[PDB]
Design a protein around this ligand. Sequence first.
Ligand code: ANP
Ligand code: ANP
Ligand code: MG
Ligand code: MG
Lengths: 299, 295
Amino acid sequence: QALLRILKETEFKKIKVLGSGAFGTVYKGLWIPEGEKVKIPVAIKELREAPKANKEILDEAYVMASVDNPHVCRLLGICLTSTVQLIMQLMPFGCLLDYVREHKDNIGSQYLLNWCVQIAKGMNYLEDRRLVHRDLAARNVLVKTPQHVKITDFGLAKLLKVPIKWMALESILHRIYTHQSDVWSYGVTVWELMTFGSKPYDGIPASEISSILEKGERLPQPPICTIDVYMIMRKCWMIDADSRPKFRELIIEFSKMARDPQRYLVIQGDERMHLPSPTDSNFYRALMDEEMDDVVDAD
Amino acid sequence: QALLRILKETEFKKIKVLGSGAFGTVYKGLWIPEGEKVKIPVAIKELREATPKANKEILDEAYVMASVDNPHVCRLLGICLTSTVQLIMQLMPFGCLLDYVREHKDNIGSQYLLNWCVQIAKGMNYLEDRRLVHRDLAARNVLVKTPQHVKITDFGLAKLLKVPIKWMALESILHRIYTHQSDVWSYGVTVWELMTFGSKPYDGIPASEISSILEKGERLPQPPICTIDVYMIMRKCWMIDADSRPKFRELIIEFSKMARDPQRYLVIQGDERMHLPSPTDSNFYRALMDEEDMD
Ligand SMILES: Nc1ncnc2c1ncn2[C@@H]1O[C@H](COP(=O)(O)OP(=O)(O)NP(=O)(O)O)[C@@H](O)[C@H]1O
Ligand SMILES: Nc1ncnc2c1ncn2[C@@H]1O[C@H](COP(=O)(O)OP(=O)(O)NP(=O)(O)O)[C@@H](O)[C@H]1O
Ligand SMILES: [Mg+2]
Ligand SMILES: [Mg+2]
């Protein structure tokens, strides 16, 4: 229980709504430690309801509180008095989807491929712990710093707007959720990144997706992607789940590609869009990211 | 070196005054990374007296200040060189340990007090290892990162430039001699400040007369909560002969020993209840505020 702090409603306040999704509402909030005069910013996710006893939710939460990996967001605290309110670290940069749309004119290959590496690393860790995400998407990758992203919202789908356009075929047709169906979503997430945040299958209703998948139709090749990168996405969307890549294979392949990033993505002005200098990296870490490094560098 | 970031004045803004000291104003500020929309809270120390040529010498010392790497010493992160030199460091919303002990007066337990003494000694020992003399150690110059993790600040500022007479070793008052052993003296005063929950040292005695009473052998008095064993360490910090003062490495051992049996060495009313930090509350503080290597 040492990893999950139980909060009294009297020691935190919700300030502003940050967003809403299939599972609840995320607020920017404050934590006021008892006996202290500081207000510490936190993120608070207030859950919709689905129903289940407080003890069973607490059991679920201890598992979410126990993930230990630089690319997965850990549940920090919980309040079960009224609604279910989860407390986690506030990520001022927001989610990676909004970030890639915001900076579509300034994202280099080194950033894009290193994000693919980090997302695969967080997902491989989840597979190690036998935790199926069920809702991996670019909106559920949080930006700690532009050089450090983290998967969030895993297993909320367990504890309780169905993301049809990210689900593997077997998940749509038969509600089968495995680590290999997470690999399908990972492939859509990579597609979101490489298109700088396009909406997948835009204009196609969700009810049609299973049918266009069965006809063999897939998301198109992003204009910056060489075939090498596009083949990885295709493999994530094979009908046979065991034929799809493994998260650990994805880590290796994207890490390789990150060592020669301009050979695998075609970006105008890429030469001027490198990872930060050592000076700027040291400054970011000291202010926002004291916890991993391991960014893969060119050459 | 890559450990000091040179900032552009357009990159940050001042949003609140936090206090002032002998060398400048400390502000709460906001850092806006270029081309981002986020506002990242920082602390800024604007120095007093407008500086040019000096700026080379300031930088050379800034690079040293930016090279300190220890969980109990604050590292300079960046610098802005305008008509006023502006230093950028991590913001510490709890503030300094002096105000902290005052506001929680007679509500702090012995385990905290003794652990702060260890941590400060570890930080000063690291500086002595680096051959760096602080010159202005005092409880006001220890910041609280979390109640479990304190850090020495303002290393290097004094050299970078009213004298804190009541924290200074006698030889520093008389001869402007500053060594690691004079830092030991100031450490003893800092500890006395903590153990008295933030009392002013030599209250009622003018600063110009401190050196006379020190030479007569007068010293700060024994705090009510301190047993003989704790007070003797403090007294040994204030020996006239600098080389018979404790070394910071010995202070680490002695305070580490006492912090394993805190109630034997500090006698505080209500120590039974106080509040030590559960693993649960400790993990929560670290995840929100303190992800660095130790405390
Ligand atoms: N810890 C956090 N810090 C900062 N922003 C966050 C945090 N968690 C979530 N957000 C933002 O708040 C929004 C709301 O999240 P959420 O309610 O999970 O919806 P979603 O993730 O966008 N879609 P869904 O997949 O249906 O949950 C997210 O899109 C994030 O951009
Ligand atoms: N990084 C920081 N975060 C938060 N508060 C800080 C920080 N650095 C300094 N302060 C506070 O800012 C105020 C001014 O500090 P400062 O100018 O250093 O004067 P001082 O520490 O009180 N005396 P002195 O340092 O000997 O000149 C004090 O209340 C400090 O606690
Ligand atoms: Mg979400
Ligand atoms: Mg100071």
